[PDB]
């Protein structure tokens, strides 16, 4: 039931108690809080209360991850949402890749969320269905800047890919439940999540305030990539406008 490996250095969750407006930040599949930490730190510095959880089975070992289901990942984010709810009158959610999937999922089940900022969020990855081994060699970090050292698992359990697929299917099916304002980031040259996902989301949600922001200087892991500053800056403008 519980993780058998210790939390990796750099993968620790981040909390900051500040003002009555809160931001939940969700990292991606096989990733860790590291991928979201510069965003989380920038938002805390700006006065927002911040919750950046570590998804169960993540930031330890891929053998731990293999033992989890998507319900465990949903639970980590529901717990972080709960933490903010006990402290904040206004709550926004943002996330990278599956973190974006989970941002959408949370907004589909909680109408009180005041806005979402999905970043290369994933609701359909046809490569999963197309593609044996218990663990796949993880693909290198899809980052335009080669100097960044993303903290992510070096192997991906195939059983976990199935979990990701089911989560995405449920999330995609319920997109029309979302009505809160949406700021949707997409890397034109995302080599992991097809960029058309941004439009599945834009068209699928029922929100009246929505836009897509195309990032032209980043690959998949945009939160750590050259476009990081713009992600942070526009996200802060978004939070202020809707708080």
Task: Explain what this protein looks like in three dimensions.
The longest helix is centred in the N-terminal third of the chain and has 16 residues, at 70-85. This protein has helices at 37-45, 62-66, 70-85, 98-109, 126-130, 158-173, 197-204, 228-242; strands at 14-16, 21-26, 49-52, 90-96, 115-119, 135-137, 155-157, 182-187, 210-215. The protein has a single domain, classed as Rossmann fold. Helix 1 (37-45) links the parallel strand 2 and strand 3. It is α/β, with parallel strands linked by helices and 243 residues long. The PDB classes it as hydrolase.
Short description:
It is classed as hydrolase. With 243 residues, the chain is of the alpha/beta class. Helix content is 35%, strand content 18%.
Keywords, please?
8 helices, monoacylglycerol lipase activity, Hydrolase_4, Esterase_lipase, two-stranded antiparallel ribbon, Thermostable monoacylglycerol lipase, seven-stranded mixed beta sheet, monomer, alpha/beta, Rossmann fold, 243 residues, EC 3.1.1.23
């Amino acid at each position: 039931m519980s993780e058998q490996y210790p939390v990796l250095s750099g993968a620790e969750p981040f909390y900051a108690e500040n003002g009555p407006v809160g931001v939940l930040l969700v990292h991606g599949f096989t990733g860790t809080p590291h991928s979201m930490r510069p965003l989380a730190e920038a938002y805390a510095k700006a006065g927002y209360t911040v919750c950046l959880p570590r998804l169960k089975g993540h930031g330890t070992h891929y053998e731990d991850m293999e033992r989890t289901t998507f319900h465990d990942w949903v639970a980590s984010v529901e717990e972080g949402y709960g933490w903010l709810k006990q402290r904040c009158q206004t709550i926004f959610v943002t996330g990278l890749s599956m973190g974006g999937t989970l941002t959408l999922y949370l907004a589909e089940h909680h109408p009180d969320i005041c806005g979402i900022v999905p970043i290369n969020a994933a609701v359909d990855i046809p490569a999963i269905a197309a593609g044996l081994p218990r663990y796949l060699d993880s693909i290198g970090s899809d980052l335009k800047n080669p100097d960044v050292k993303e903290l992510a698992y070096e192997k991906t359990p195939t059983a976990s890919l199935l979990q990701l697929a089911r989560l995405m299917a449920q999330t995609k099916a319920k997109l029309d439940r979302i009505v809160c304002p949406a700021l949707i980031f997409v890397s034109d040259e995302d080599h992991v999540v097809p960029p058309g996902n941004a439009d599945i989301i834009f068209q699928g949600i029922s929100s009246t305030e929505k836009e897509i922001v195309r990032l032209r200087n980043s690959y998949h892991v945009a939160t750590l990539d050259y476009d990081q500053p713009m992600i942070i800056e526009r996200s802060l403008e978004f939070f202020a406008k809707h708080a």
